[PDB]
Amino acid sequence: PSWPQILGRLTDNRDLARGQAAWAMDQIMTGNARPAQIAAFAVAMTMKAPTADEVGELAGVMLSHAHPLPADTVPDDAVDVVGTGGDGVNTVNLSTMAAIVVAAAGVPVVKHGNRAASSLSGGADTLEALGVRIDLGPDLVARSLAEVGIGFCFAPRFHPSYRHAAAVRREIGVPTVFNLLGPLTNPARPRAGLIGCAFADLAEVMAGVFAARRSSVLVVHGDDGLDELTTTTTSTIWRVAAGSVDKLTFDPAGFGFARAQLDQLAGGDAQANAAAVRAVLGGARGPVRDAVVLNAAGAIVAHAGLSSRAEWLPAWEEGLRRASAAIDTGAAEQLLARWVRFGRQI
């Protein structure tokens, strides 16, 4: 294989042969690709329209190179809540808030995340401002998960060989297929997830990658453009269960949610977004809470799907009940406090 061969095939608008995307990603991950080659590959793949097979190869290479968690430290039913980012709408950190609530409901959460790329504050930035340690290595993440019920895998700490690709992503500035890889490369490899996709025409490809792994996952795109389950309108959901993908339209009004305006979900810098986390966890009513509860419930539904006996509507009602109770009893607020203390106590 070679760059001229692979890039030529993509510019001819042809799908790659089996193993070609993997070869490319591995060249990229070993410091063996020129920045120009990395860029051409990212752009060419994006414009051809990447297939699930191709994206799965990219993600697989990344997972091969990632720092893994220690054997037997990740519960079989661990869940992630994370999105591509890049929806362009500056919101509060919905996935991060949802993840805390989910953990507090008793679902183990190993969250993958990163700093902002185009937003004012990313999940990692907001966690840092809350006093949560985002610098933890494999062993300490495993301990966080066991002792607190949640662990945070900071993308740059677990994927050091992605350095070169990350740099090129920053330089070119446009979204590419690389923007899909974060949610697909959690180093703890959880089998369930609520996965947000900002790019409506690539969400089905992300869902195909999860289906290949037989994950129980909801890939979500709010019909307003959010990489989260939205409260402002319907959301498209690509449901992954039993190795197949199901596309459906989701309306939170069907569960009693009131239509919000995007303005109401608006965020700020790390300090502002941290304050919004404390506000929700302290029981504050309103649009932000509603959005947090809905997404927390979505992750609980994904967790439920790890069993083939899970039914859609009863799963959602249970998810909503559990998410609401985890906040209302103060369990979510206490969990955050316990998470902060854990990192301080080394």
Ligand X SMILES: O=P(O)(O)OC[C@H]1O[C@H](OP(=O)(O)OP(=O)(O)O)[C@H](O)[C@@H]1O
Ligand Y SMILES: O=C(O)c1ccccc1O
Give the number of other Cβ atoms within 10 Å of residue 147's Cβ: 13
Q: Which is nearer to ligand Y, 29 or 304 (CB)?
A: 29
153 — phi, psi (to 5°)? -100, 105
Q: Given the structure tokens 């339209």, which residue do they identify?
A: 249
Segment interacting with ligand Y, rule: CB under 6 A, options 151-159, 194-202, 234-242, 248-256: 151-159
Asked if residues 221 and 203 have their Cβ atoms less than 8 Å apart, the reply is yes
> Is 321 assigned to a binding site?
no
Residue 3 burial class via C-beta count within 10 angstroms: exposed 0-12, middle 13-18, buried 19 and up = middle
> Is 123 assigned to a binding site?
yes
Q: Which is nearer to a copy of itself, 176 or 231 (CB)?
A: 176
Euclidean distance between CA atoms 264 and 243, whole angstroms:
37
83 binds Mg ion (CB under 5 A): yes
298 binds Mg ion (CB under 5 A): no
**Sequential DSSP letters for 125-148:** HHHHHHT------HHHHHHHHHHH
Q: How far is the CB of 228 from Mg ion (least distance, A)?
A: 5
44 binds a copy of itself (CB under 8 A): yes
163 binds ligand Y (CB under 6 A): yes
Helices (H), the chain: 3-11, 20-29, 35-48, 52-65, 94-104, 123-130, 138-148, 155-158, 163-172, 181-184, 203-212, 270-281, 287-304, 312-328, 331-344
Q: Which is nearer to a copy of itself, 167 or 242 (CB)?
A: 167
Q: How far is the CB of 39 from a copy of itself (least distance, A)?
A: 4
Pick the binder of ligand Y from 114, 126, 215, 273 (CB under 6 A).
114
Residue list 20-39, contact with a copy of itself (CB under 8 A): 34-39
Residue list 194-223, contact with ligand X (CB under 6 A): 196
230 binds ligand X (CB under 6 A): no
Residue 235 binding result from a copy of itself, ligand X, Mg ion, none, given CB thresholds of 5 to 8 Å by partner type:
none
119 binds ligand X (CB under 6 A): yes
Binding mask 199-238 for Mg ion (x = CB under 5 A): ----------------------------xx----------
Euclidean distance between CA atoms 305 and 192, whole angstroms:
8
> Is 30 assigned to a binding site?
no
Residue 30 binding result from ligand X, a copy of itself, Mg ion, none, given CB thresholds of 5 to 8 Å by partner type:
none
Q: Which residues contact 125 (CB under 8 A, 6 or more apart)?
A: 115, 116, 270, 273
Q: Which is nearer to ligand Y, 160 or 314 (CB)?
A: 160
Pick the binder of ligand X from 33, 44, 55, 82 (CB under 6 A).
82
Helices (H), 105-220: 123-130, 138-148, 155-158, 163-172, 181-184, 203-212
Residue list 131-170, contact with a copy of itself (CB under 8 A): 167-168
DSSP 177: G
Nearest CA to 291 out of 254, 315, 323 is that of: 323
> Is 307 assigned to a binding site?
no
Nearest CA to 290 out of 282, 299, 280 is that of: 280
Residue 267 binding result from ligand Y, Mg ion, a copy of itself, none, given CB thresholds of 5 to 8 Å by partner type:
none
Residue 275 binding result from Mg ion, a copy of itself, ligand X, none, given CB thresholds of 5 to 8 Å by partner type:
none
HSE-CB for 33 with a 13 A CA cutoff:
29
Rounded alpha-carbon distances, angstroms, from residue 169 to 21, 113, 294, 324: 17, 16, 31, 38
Euclidean distance between CA atoms 247 and 250, whole angstroms:
10
Q: Which residue numbers belong to the known binding site for 5-phospho-alpha-D-ribose 1-diphosphate?
A: 83, 86-87, 91, 93-96, 111-119, 123
Q: Which residues bind ligand X (CB under 6 A)?
A: 82-83, 85-86, 93-96, 113-114, 116-119, 122-124, 182, 196, 228
Q: Which residues bind a copy of itself (CB under 8 A)?
A: 2-4, 7-8, 11, 13, 34-40, 42-44, 46-48, 167-168, 171-176
